[PDB]
Amino acid sequence: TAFLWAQNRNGLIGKDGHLPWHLPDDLHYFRAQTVGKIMVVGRRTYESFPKRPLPERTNVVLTHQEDYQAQGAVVVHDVAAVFAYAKQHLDQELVIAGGAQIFTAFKDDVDTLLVTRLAGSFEGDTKMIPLNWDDFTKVSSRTVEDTNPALTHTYEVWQKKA
Ligand SMILES: NC(=O)C1=CN([C@@H]2O[C@H](COP(=O)(O)OP(=O)(O)OC[C@H]3O[C@@H](n4cnc5c(N)ncnc54)[C@H](OP(=O)(O)O)[C@@H]3O)[C@@H](O)[C@H]2O)C=CC1
Numbered sequence: 617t618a619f620l621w622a623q624n625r626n627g628l629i630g631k632d633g634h635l636p637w638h639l640p641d642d643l644h645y646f647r648a649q650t651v652g653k654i655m656v657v658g659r660r661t662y663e664s665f666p667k668r669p670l671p672e673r674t675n676v677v678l679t680h681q682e683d684y685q686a687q688g689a690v691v692v693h694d695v696a697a698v699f700a701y702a703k704q705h706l707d708q709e710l711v712i713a714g715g716a717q718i719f720t721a722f723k724d725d726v727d728t729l730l731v732t733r734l735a736g737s738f739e740g741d742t743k744m745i746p747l748n749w750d751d752f753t754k755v756s757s758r759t760v761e762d763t764n765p766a767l768t769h770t771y772e773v774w775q776k777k778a
């Protein structure tokens with residue numbers, strides 16, 4: 617199970633229910649990373665997608681609303697249902713795409729971090745959950761420079777030590 621997120625230099629991930637930046641490169645990397653997999657997102661991050669569901673991947677939406685409707689998405693209500701779905705699934709990798717409340721609900725079962733680090737600093741209200749960095753190794757790092765230098769970013773892959 618992977619977590620996939622983008623954060624500024626201080627860890628910021630969101631502002632007013634939306635992204636605090638607009639960084640197309642990162643969105644085509646998101647898609648690369650989630651097409652074909654089981655993609656888990658919290659109800660509020662799902663309602664912020666411009667097309668719901670996002671196509672070519674299983675969107676699982678985590679909601680406490682018993683009645684919620686999301687045509688074409690897998691609507692569950694606790695973490696045990698996510699993993700009961702993933703157990704049925706097998707051959708699709710599970711990727712937790714946010715936001716903060718869902719990262720906290722899977723904080724013990726993630727093995728890989730797919731982090732995009734922005735060089736700048738943005739204003740918002742939601743930060744990435746604290747994680748033990750010391751328990752992971754950075755395996756891969758690729759940097760993309762943008763003409764807004766706040767937007768220059770690094771894609772890192774981190775994998776959990778034995
Ligand atoms: N920079 C980036 O990589 C990322 C950015 N973001 C940003 O993060 C913010 C969204 O984060 P946050 O506000 O934490 O929202 P979430 O996307 O994590 O959604 C929270 C909703 O999730 C449902 N929920 C939470 N935990 C549970 C549980 N254990 N079981 C079942 N339902 C659960 C509830 O929905 P209900 O209210 O329907 O009960 C709760 O309101 C936005 O600004 C967004 O843009 C989001 C993803 C990635």
Ligand SMILES: CN(Cc1cnc2nc(N)nc(N)c2n1)c1ccc(C(=O)N[C@@H](CCC(=O)O)C(=O)O)cc1
Nearest residue numbers: 620621622642643644646647664665666670713714732
């Ligand atoms: C708000 N949000 C959450 C979002 C944004 N960037 C992230 N970036 C990373 N690295 N990780 C995340 N979990 C992440 N989540 C969104 C908004 C749009 C789409 C979206 O349109 N994406 C298209 C691709 C489109 C583009 O390629 O212009 C997709 O097909 O995946 C994805 C996530």
